Amino acid sequence: MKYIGAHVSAAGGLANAAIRAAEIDATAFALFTKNQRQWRAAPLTTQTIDEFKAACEKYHYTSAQILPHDSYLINLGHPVTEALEKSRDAFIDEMQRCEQLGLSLLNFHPGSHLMQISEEDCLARIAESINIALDKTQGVTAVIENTAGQGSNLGFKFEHLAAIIDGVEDKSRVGVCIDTCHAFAAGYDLRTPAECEKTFADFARTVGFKYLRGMHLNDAKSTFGSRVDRHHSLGEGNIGHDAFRWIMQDDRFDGIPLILETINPDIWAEEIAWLKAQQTEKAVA
Template identity: 30%
Template sequence: MTSSNNPVGGHVPVAGGLATGGLKYAAEIGAETVQVFVSNPRGWALPEGKPAEDAKLRERDDVTVYVHTPYLVNFGSPSEETLAKSVATVRHSLLRGHAIGARGVVVHTGSAVTQSYDEAMKQVREHVLPLLEEIPEGGPDLLLEPMAGQGNMLCAKVQDLGEFFERLDHHPRLGVCFDTCHAFAAGHDLAAPGGAARTMDELVAAVGENRLKLVHANDSKDACGSAKDRHENIGAGRIGEEPFAELFRHPAVAGVPFVIETPGRGAEPHAKDVATLKRLRDG
């Protein structure tokens, strides 16, 4: 059953069906929460759902569900085609998320590519605010995920989220997905004594309380500040185990689910990471 504190789970493959395949894998790794793709993560195709599969996910009250949008989405892009496809894709993810009972839809904060930060952020307001207004009652929140700091990224440090929330009028359906590997790569030294707690304090200062809705729990293959988004299994990377325990103890993280996106083929390495996080949570 789902912990009343912090459900722990993982991103699950959906071969064999969104619910059938996804929930089977969730059981194999001991997941209390899952994250899924509802379309090709590296494409623009927007498939329809299957009502029977959707109902299976929607009716499971022991597993919370989240959707991750495709990686191509970028509201800071200077390309009109990319912008239009990004809007359509996030709208599709929100609608599909509502159909499966998802609590949140995760979207990367994107890059300005070749244009200025201000031009890109004007586009964020123009295109994301209407999507937030469209979310139906009972539908998922839209969760902004800061990046690792590579390229002309719009948001990497948690402080950068403040400008996003300002541009989007602190919309009530707006939340944050905090990725530990991304934050570490961007320069938040989670491995330093008190580093994880300090970063959570900075996040709350930037966006306010109760905006953190999901944690992507990933160790890092690379050093703090590397701007390299390379995930490692929990405790096997440069972050180590203790910062995850420190996150669980922080008031801003109370009740927030943790989802792993760690390396490895098959259920075994992911089951180990889920078990490690549960031990740190319950210790």
Template identity: 45%
Template sequence: MDGEGGRGAAAQKPKKSLPASNKVKRRTRKDENPASDDSPKSEPSKKRITSKIETAKSKGSDDKKQKSKKKETTNKTQTQNTDTSTDVKPETDAFRNQTSERKTRVRKKPNNDNPKRVEKEVEVSEMVTKHLHRSLSSHKYVGAHVSIQGGLWKAVVEAKRIGARAFGLFLRSQRTWNSKPLEEEAAEKFRSTCDELGFEPRYILPHSPYLMNLGSPKPDVFQKSRAMLVEELNRCQKLGLTLYNIHPGSHIGEMPVGKCLELIADGINYAHSQVSGVTVVLENMSCQGSTVGGRFEELRGIIDHVEDKSRIGVCLDTCHAFAAGHNLSEKTGLQRMLDEFSEIVGLSYLKAVHLNDSKGGVGCRLDRHENIGRGHIGLEGFRKVMNEPRFNEIPMILETPASSHFEDYSDEIDLLYSLCE
């Protein structure tokens, strides 16, 4: 993933114009500040994004206003009540990438702090109700990476509000080695809210902090990363979760790739020996810099060295795959990629999908997420993704940036379900 917990935000560059066939009708947001607690709610008609692929022309002064507002808001970052000290410089390209974009949006309004009867208090729009109904026949569990601001259980409420059938989240601050212990009361709130709002553990995909690098040739970083993985799997166990997504790691140019893959597997084996019941899910990467996991052979290399094959899996990120050279915008691109994955890794290891368009072109090796239909994969590429039966019954998680084109994740979820045939 490219991703948040609150996910950090810095100013984003203006988006380049794409072919008309990839554009989605532009929306005007009532409140450009995603962190505002008192932003007015949009009417259902204004929150509906058309399922048709429309051609949009530039809007001159309206675009300038939107860009001006975006500059004022995208520099704001979310904060968490955790220790922010770090004594080891982050090594992975993933950490550096996240300083340039926010990948998770903050809920519009604070939720009631009482988790009891929370289902009755979740406001769901007419659009969300419709796409939830449509999703039932699709066998696709689409959701988004949601903020844990205010407590882990509030992420569940936010997932419900946006009409998600699955969701991702950080279990703690993603930018620090240290964090507060997970209290049993907080864990119980999370579990009970998941039960009440109907989210099963198999459709919840926690994400590792960006500091983690199990492939580091530096002993202190490797030890910290391994300890972090154990701590995170313990959190999953307390929360009743069964999946945990990680970026494999980086050799930082100081170790052969093969040795790096073995080191990553060693870290996973150790964590497995300390914590039971949680599957570690390896995310494919974009082949950027010294990161590993961009090639399916590298993912297979890690899996080969993992002792408990029943507790290892893979999450396919569409942006990362596209950047690594799999042309998902082509008619047969997805089919070819999945056939290759099946041959090299094995479909039995496919546990989840990260849904992201790509700012960079095919094979660019850049980890730059874009909103669905606004990047180089395009809507037709995601139409194939949404109608691919091999993606049935697994979590499909959006990690796209905040944008003036979509008011919140519910718009993109609705758009994706509209592509189902």
């Protein structure tokens, strides 16, 4: 079974994310559990937690179907150790919020070296950040998202993801999420079925599908290899519709949240319905 949805708004409270997902007939969703800017969020109340859990149960969203995203301001590889510690504090807080909400996954971009430390050293700092958070929480898997590679952001090569995982002690609570826009921007082609298979065999050799815990299904406004992160609605960007048919027809993408971060929320219900239909419509190679 595939689980298909969108990164919906949590405006008016976390439970409204589940309600919004249900209104677009999603079978998965993503959300932020707090505003991104605030270093430290007011603690979750018992009232917020119960309303969230009640809405998830009303609309049949289990923990396996929900892929929260951390704040973009967290840098788990920060070269300034005092800033690293503040990012680690925020990440532990985000992981604790997930635990309190009954969530089992947390998706995050790995980090950035700010031209002050080597790639190797930044990746090692990120693995240690994960280890710290996993020692301070229970039941939540740290899901590393690949990136477009803008600026000094790491995670644009699959080998980066594998290097982080190698440094994680409890590998049962680490995984990865592949964002199709990010992959394409980083130079992994997706424009034909053959190219999709080439990209995912590379993923299999370097990381392995045993670590795959989510996908972000985005077309790309930016161009191939541009190392620019600009999403587009399915079919409207430079990837095109065939990659998404290919993903929907491949059983390796079952059982995990498949999340739109496409740029027109008015068509999310149509994008979700189209994705569901491609599972059984005309086969691509």
